[PDB]
């Protein structure tokens, strides 16, 4: 089996860097620092990054470069009993793309809207406004701000929907934007990594261009320093609370994104003897250092808001699409040279989203290609196939009720799935396959065994830190709601179906691919425990 290789090494590094650094670096990590003790949040975040995140990040990268195949085949060739870990992970990626791509479309619809002398979301006297319109954020829900009203009444038209049952009309001015984001991935992924590794040059490096000029802009702002206090000023009593230790753990895991077969896939196109330990440590550090930089560009202007604009930090220090689509653009409309800072900011949102979706799909193409030879044969027209299923189910997120669709998939489709799909990923390679064999594997590639530190981290703290996240993520489960809208009972259930449908194939394939092989029980448990390498 002779497979394509990276036409240059930084092609791989940028594609990994681009996949790892994404929206969560800018629209969640800063809020977590502000909410969990500032600089004192970096200690539990640093520890859960050393024992939790990087070991999982390092492992998948080594697994990719070593077994030279995508997620489906790779996990089949490791523990045949757990080949459904492959199918689960490619299903989670699949579900994720049904919803994670509209955030890119939102940031593009704003990009097109910033071509004017006066940006449309600054005043409260347009067709789409209400008497409850205030200039900026406040304590109360019923009286929203001018940018809150531009997003929910002109872009989404969310107010014209009575819930998930009423998607209503279909936003034809915005279904277009989701079409643009799907071409830019086509013309960069149909030719393999030959062109993908080249496109990521722009979309993984442009964020740092945008981060730099927005950093120098936000720092030479009245009240800039004030924000940096709200961001880093220590409060070490946070360290004592398990919530920041959980918030650290869950932020570290989801922001590094190991397990989806994307780092598997990206590394599976590497030269076998590449120093993957160096690549893991470097790119994982770029990911966290980017978040630190991102907090300064975010909270500097957040400070310019509490000073020059007179708002509570409580009312503007948020996270998620609220921060990048209502509050931060509201600052932009006020500053001088306003519309310039908006264009490069919304491109930063788009370029931060594209590389990270390049990874999720590539996890699919190189997992399906390397398992079925027919699909590998016509990659250019298979990557045309699923990019139509993503777009057709994707106009649902483009209806007036599209946000109700996006939110349901956000809390259900992949969040709970991948956590247990990786917990099984963890103890599969660490106890079934063994750290004995795994240390042997990377010593043969890079020349030295991983220290005892990495294997005790892979064997003990990896599943605990995983359970520590899953437990925390469960005790914060209320039935799904948004604002005054409580979803119907059946919508919570269908969400649990999308969550289970991916990870159900863990014991499925197991049970299927168990009886399907011959022999007695124990005499067959070892047939599905003997790895593909140990067979030749």
């Amino acid at each position: 089996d002779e497979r394509e290789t990276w036409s240059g090494k930084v092609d791989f590094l940028l594609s990994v860097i681009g996949y790892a650094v994404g929206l969560a670096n800018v629209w969640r990590f800063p809020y977590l620092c502000y909410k969990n003790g500032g600089g004192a949040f970096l200690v539990p975040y640093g520890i859960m990054l050393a024992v939790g995140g990087i070991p999982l990040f390092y492992m998948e990268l080594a697994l990719g470069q070593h077994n030279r195949k995508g997620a489906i085949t790779c996990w089949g060739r490791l523990v045949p009993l757990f080949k459904g870990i492959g199918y689960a992970v490619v299903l989670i990626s699949f579900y994720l793309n049904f919803y994670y791509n509209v955030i890119i479309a939102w940031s593009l619809r704003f990009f097109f809207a910033s071509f004017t002398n006066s940006l449309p979301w600054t005043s409260c006297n347009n067709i789409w406004n209400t008497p409850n319109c205030r200039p900026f954020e406040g304590h109360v829900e019923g009286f929203q701000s001018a940018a809150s009203e531009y997003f929910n009444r002109y872009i989404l038209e969310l107010n014209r929907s009575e819930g998930i049952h009423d998607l209503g009309a279909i936003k034809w001015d915005m279904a277009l934007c989701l079409l643009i984001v799907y071409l830019i991935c086509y013309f960069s992924l149909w030719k393999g990594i030959s062109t993908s590794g080249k496109v990521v040059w722009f979309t993984a490096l442009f964020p740092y261009a945008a981060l730099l000029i927005l950093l120098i802009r936000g720092l030479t702002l009245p009240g800039s320093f004030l924000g940096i206090q709200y961001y880093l000023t220590p409060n070490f009593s946070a360290i004592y609370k398990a919530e920041v230790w959980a918030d650290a753990a869950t932020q570290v895991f989801f922001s590094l994104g190991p397990g989806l077969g994307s780092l598997l896939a990206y590394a599976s196109y590497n030269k076998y003897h590449n120093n993957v330990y160096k690549d893991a440590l470097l790119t994982s550090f770029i990911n966290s250092a980017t978040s630190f930089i991102a907090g300064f560009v975010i909270f500097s202007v957040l400070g310019y808001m509490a000073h020059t604009l007179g708002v509570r930090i409580e009312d503007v220090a948020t996270s998620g699409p609220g921060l990048v689509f209502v509050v931060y653009p509201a600052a932009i409309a006020t500053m001088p040279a306003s519309t310039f800072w908006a264009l490069i900011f919304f491109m930063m949102l788009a370029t931060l989203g594209l590389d990270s979706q390049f990874g999720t799909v590539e996890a699919i193409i190189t997992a399906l290609s390397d398992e079925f030879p027919k699909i590998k044969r016509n990659r250019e027209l298979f990557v045309a196939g699923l990019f139509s299923l993503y777009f057709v189910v994707g106009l649902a997120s483009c209806t007036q009720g599209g946000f109700y669709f996006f939110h349901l998939l956000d809390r259900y489709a992949a969040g709970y799935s991948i956590l247990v799909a990786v917990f099984f990923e963890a103890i599969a390679v660490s106890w079934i396959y063994g750290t004995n064999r795994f240390s042997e594997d990377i010593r043969d590639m890079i020349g030295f065994p991983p220290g005892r530190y990495w294997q005790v981290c892979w064997r003990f703290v990896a599943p605990i830190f995983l359970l520590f996240i899953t437990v925390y993520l469960l005790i914060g489960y209320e039935p799904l709601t948004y604002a005054d809208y409580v979803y119907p009972s059946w919508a919570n259930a269908l969400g649990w179906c999308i969550a289970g449908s991916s990870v159900v194939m863990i014991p499925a394939v197991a049970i299927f691919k168990l009886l399907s092989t011959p022999g007695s029980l124990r005499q067959r448990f070892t047939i599905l425990t003997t790895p593909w390498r140990d067979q030749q």
Partner: antibody, heavy 119, light 109 residues
Framework: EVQLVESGGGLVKPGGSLKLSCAAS????????MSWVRQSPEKRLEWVAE????????YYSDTVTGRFTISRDNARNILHLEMSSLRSEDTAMYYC????????????WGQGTTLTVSS | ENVLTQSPAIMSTSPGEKVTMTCRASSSVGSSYLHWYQQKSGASPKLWIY???NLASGVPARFSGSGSGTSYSLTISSVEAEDAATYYC?????????FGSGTKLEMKR
């Protein structure tokens, strides 16, 4: 504390077949790549074969490939080299040497067992 | 196969001299993978210098190593009478693993 002793070895005829063994003591033999390296009477050092920590990776000298076979026993802590089709050029002292990490070379070397293949 | 020839084959020196033996590789070798062994007569080689320049345990500080790519060298800064031995360079960067021709340290008199 760490100790390597080789054995087997002696006069053997061309085409003949012998098997050496190394006896690791004083360290977890199971977690270390091992290598046989031989020294001709001209004192030329020549590496022969390497077996990884769990036997799942094997490399051979080309002048020795096809005829020699290297093996471990991590239960009894013993490394093996069994040879057939012995040409006379294979006469040497046979050193068995610990060498897990490549970036650090062969930490420990045995005392050697000498094999003259001659008629 | 990457042949490493050393020079000089026999180096005659005095306890006090400052000597340097070189190791020229037919093909380039990474600095992490070139090593040095000392073998006193009637005994087995001891790892002397690993990764071009790091000294094993109990290697006197008078020894040093340097080089890159195709050319490396072992340097004794002030030879003592106990450095009479044979010194081998070995590459660990590709298979087959290869050793050097050897440099033998003999004492002048």
């Amino acid at each position: 504390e760490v100790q390597l002793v080789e054995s087997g070895g002696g006069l053997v005829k061309p085409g003949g077949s012998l098997k050496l063994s190394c006896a690791a003591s004083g360290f977890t033999f199971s977690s270390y790549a091992m290598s046989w390296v031989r020294q001709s009477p001209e004192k030329r050092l020549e590496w022969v074969a390497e077996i990884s920590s769990g036997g799942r990776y094997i490399y051979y000298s080309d002048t020795v490939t096809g005829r020699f076979t290297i093996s471990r026993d991590n239960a009894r802590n013993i490394l093996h080299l069994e040879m057939s089709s012995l040409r006379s050029e294979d006469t040497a002292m046979y050193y068995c040497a610990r060498g897990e990490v490549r970036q650090r070379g062969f930490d420990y070397w045995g005392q050697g067992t000498t094999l003259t293949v001659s008629s | 196969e990457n042949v490493l020839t050393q020079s000089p084959a026999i180096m005659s020196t005095s306890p006090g001299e400052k000597v340097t033996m070189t190791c020229r590789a037919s093909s380039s070798v990474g600095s992490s993978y070139l090593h040095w062994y000392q073998q006193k007569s009637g005994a087995s080689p001891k790892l002397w210098i690993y990764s071009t320049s790091n000294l094993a345990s109990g290697v006197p500080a008078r020894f040093s190593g340097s080089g890159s790519g195709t050319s490396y060298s072992l340097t004794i800064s002030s030879v003592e009478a106990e450095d009479a031995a044979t010194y081998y360079c070995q590459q660990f960067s590709g298979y087959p693993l290869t050793f050097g021709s050897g440099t033998k340290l003999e004492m002048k008199r």
